[PDB]
Design a protein around this ligand. Sequence first.
Ligand SMILES: NC(=O)c1ccc[n+]([C@@H]2O[C@H](COP(=O)([O-])OP(=O)(O)OC[C@H]3O[C@@H](n4cnc5c(N)ncnc54)[C@H](O)[C@@H]3O)[C@@H](O)[C@H]2O)c1
Ligand SMILES: NC(=O)c1ccc[n+]([C@@H]2O[C@H](COP(=O)([O-])OP(=O)(O)OC[C@H]3O[C@@H](n4cnc5c(N)ncnc54)[C@H](O)[C@@H]3O)[C@@H](O)[C@H]2O)c1
Ligand SMILES: N[C@@H](CCC(=O)N[C@@H](CSCO)C(=O)NCC(=O)O)C(=O)O
Ligand SMILES: [K+]
Ligand SMILES: [Zn+2]
Ligand SMILES: [Zn+2]
Ligand SMILES: [Zn+2]
Ligand SMILES: [Zn+2]
Lengths: 373, 373
Amino acid sequence: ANEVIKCKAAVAWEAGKPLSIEEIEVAPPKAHEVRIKIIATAVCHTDAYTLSGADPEGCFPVILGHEGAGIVESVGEGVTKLKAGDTVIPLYIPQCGECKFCLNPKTNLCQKIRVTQGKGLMPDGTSRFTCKGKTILHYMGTSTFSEYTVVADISVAKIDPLAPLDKVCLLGCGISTGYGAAVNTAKLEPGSVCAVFGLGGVGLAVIMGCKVAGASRIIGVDINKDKFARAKEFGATECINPQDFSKPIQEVLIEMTDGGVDYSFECIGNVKVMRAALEACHKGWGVSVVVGVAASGEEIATRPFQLVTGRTWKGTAFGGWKSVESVPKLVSEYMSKKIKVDEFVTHNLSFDEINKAFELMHSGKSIRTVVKI
Amino acid sequence: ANEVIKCKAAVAWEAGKPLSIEEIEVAPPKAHEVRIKIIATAVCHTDAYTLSGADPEGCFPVILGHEGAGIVESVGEGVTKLKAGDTVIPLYIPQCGECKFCLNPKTNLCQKIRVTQGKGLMPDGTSRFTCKGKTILHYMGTSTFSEYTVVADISVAKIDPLAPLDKVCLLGCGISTGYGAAVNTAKLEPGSVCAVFGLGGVGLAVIMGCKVAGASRIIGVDINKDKFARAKEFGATECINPQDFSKPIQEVLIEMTDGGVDYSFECIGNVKVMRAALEACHKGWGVSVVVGVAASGEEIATRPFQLVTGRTWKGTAFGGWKSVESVPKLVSEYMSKKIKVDEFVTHNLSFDEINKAFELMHSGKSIRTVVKI
Ligand SMILES: NC(=O)c1ccc[n+]([C@@H]2O[C@H](COP(=O)([O-])OP(=O)(O)OC[C@H]3O[C@@H](n4cnc5c(N)ncnc54)[C@H](O)[C@@H]3O)[C@@H](O)[C@H]2O)c1
Ligand SMILES: NC(=O)c1ccc[n+]([C@@H]2O[C@H](COP(=O)([O-])OP(=O)(O)OC[C@H]3O[C@@H](n4cnc5c(N)ncnc54)[C@H](O)[C@@H]3O)[C@@H](O)[C@H]2O)c1
Ligand SMILES: N[C@@H](CCC(=O)N[C@@H](CSCO)C(=O)NCC(=O)O)C(=O)O
Ligand SMILES: [K+]
Ligand SMILES: [Zn+2]
Ligand SMILES: [Zn+2]
Ligand SMILES: [Zn+2]
Ligand SMILES: [Zn+2]
């Protein structure tokens, strides 16, 4: 039978404090849940956002992390598709396959367990984590910052058993989102001119997709010149820094493309930049995709004349991928060298140095840091 | 050759005042210009919008009117495809047929003469109108409030001679716009749930459009409940008055539709309503098309979350119709009984009493009033 597991995990006891490697107990999978052994996990600004305490939905104590890869240790009752030993990737965006959203081709926002997930609990409404007698909450339905975690069976993607987990763990968030943003949400046609605001993991993943889509031009935009080199490596035909212009960045791009870009992508989370990204699109057919997440309360704006004159405002969630179906495929494209992953890893750390991941992130000296459990 | 024409026209000397029946002069067609004898014309809200001054490019004195129909009185040098006697409709949105835009299937916004047109002048930078020694400006390139008008030769649609001009003149704007907002911009699929804000001429044309597309639920929304009766006759499954509810109209719609409409259309020009229309859309795939023209400087807004979670903001002009190609086909669809036009005419007046047409519109008593020249 499946027993309780005593393992280590980086607990976030309180907002605004660093993570604490702690000894915890992980309960066995209940019906339609699977316990996974995380081999590798990366850190994203999203983890940091909840850690700061600025997140209205963030609760503590909790186990963060939503970018991991690992192996199925065991499954609860009712679980057929998965078995102990399967190589997998936890999914913050699930795919039950039967809800209103899963059944609609135009979205991937499965709602079967959203409510319970926002509260950091399994579908049965209870947490599977305990530490020093206290209950520790789940996070984004994944909690990848533990040697062992439990997720809803509808939150797992079975992937190629040969995929390096300390690499592929990044398909859990940033790469898939950026890539899908270009290929799924925008569906840019070969030869189109694109602009990308923000050159972090997401922006680079976007550039990657524009390049596979056959974009004729791909303009990178970032206030951090250091990001340019790698962007060019990814496919950016040219990079520009807003700080080097006195005119609004929209006007700059319009000049550079004789009207504006065919597609633009905001990968920062800055409401003002989002407006610029929209306005920088070509009149009559320009499309702008918002990929970045703005701080609660903040809102976007522009003159309706912009939409009336042909521009379209869009957005994306996890690159619009139906998680369970897509991720295994994305892994295969990686194995086939169709897409890049290794190139997104800028730093590697052991589980104890996990806090340094957050530090590298603020330094801006980082795209993605993979933490070996 | 062609001589000057001494005729009658409704001149608007200054904003915020009723038009003035004046005896003007109309110069002959210069190279690539066409002089049209207007047989019938109506009043779109956009005409009043300009007459009030809220137009970013409203200059006076000017001869308004962009919904009309008549006969080609004569043509200027180089005009081959159009001859005297041709039954035509003046287009405020041209189709040069060769610019960057005309060649792109994703738009209908020819820019060939947009600049000059915005200033109320012919392509050569001059006006063909004069009254009491003072030069009078064109409007939207059509100026249909005159017995005779001169337009660019790329602002002319040659239609079926048999078409009743006192009817199809409405296809010059309102009807075609609303209809296309649904068929071209939204391209709504059969069975989709729709919401239409503003049940005027444009709104009913939107409903008519949703109906032909095979929409399931079509929810009309208007503060003037007297608009409901005809809305339902056009296809609205039901109407709701925003005032009869304490909750913001978005929540009402979200509640009625178990999440929001698949498509919404703002046909009023209210920036706050435009935001509601977008937020009334369903998560993951909702699309909102802005059709109404907003007052200078005003902007629409919302939390980017709305876009990130699946909703799309679009806009349209003249329903996205390639004017010179489409209008002729549109009157054909009217002739074949495929779309309605006659049911839009609620009043009829002579030229001398054109101001009454404006009063009725501000009174909300009409949809469209055809003024017999
Ligand atoms: N929609 C989704 O599903 C989804 C998924 C993951 C992440 N995100 C969001 O994507 C955004 C980016 O994530 P990331 O990992 O790539 O983060 P990142 O911080 O590493 O990338 C952002 C880049 O934007 C640059 N930048 C900041 N202000 C700028 C400005 N005014 N103009 C141009 N560039 C500017 C920064 O220097 C940085 O290089 C965040 O909002 C993240 O939360 C969304
Ligand atoms: N994009 C285009 O090409 C295009 C074309 C034609 C018209 N327009 C614009 O579309 C709008 C409608 O034009 P029209 O000729 O049909 O005028 P209209 O007077 O017939 O439309 C106004 C209708 O909306 C209703 N309405 C006003 N405020 C409302 C509110 N707060 N909530 C619900 N309903 C409200 C009015 O009572 C009336 O029923 C105007 O802004 C017009 O300028 C745009
Ligand atoms: N002058 C306004 C724009 C007004 C506007 O949107 N006009 C529509 C037709 S409304 C039908 O009566 C249009 O043709 N848009 C395309 C364009 O104006 O180039 C403003 O500047 O805000
Ligand atoms: K569609
Ligand atoms: Zn992340
Ligand atoms: Zn689902
Ligand atoms: Zn109009
Ligand atoms: Zn053109």
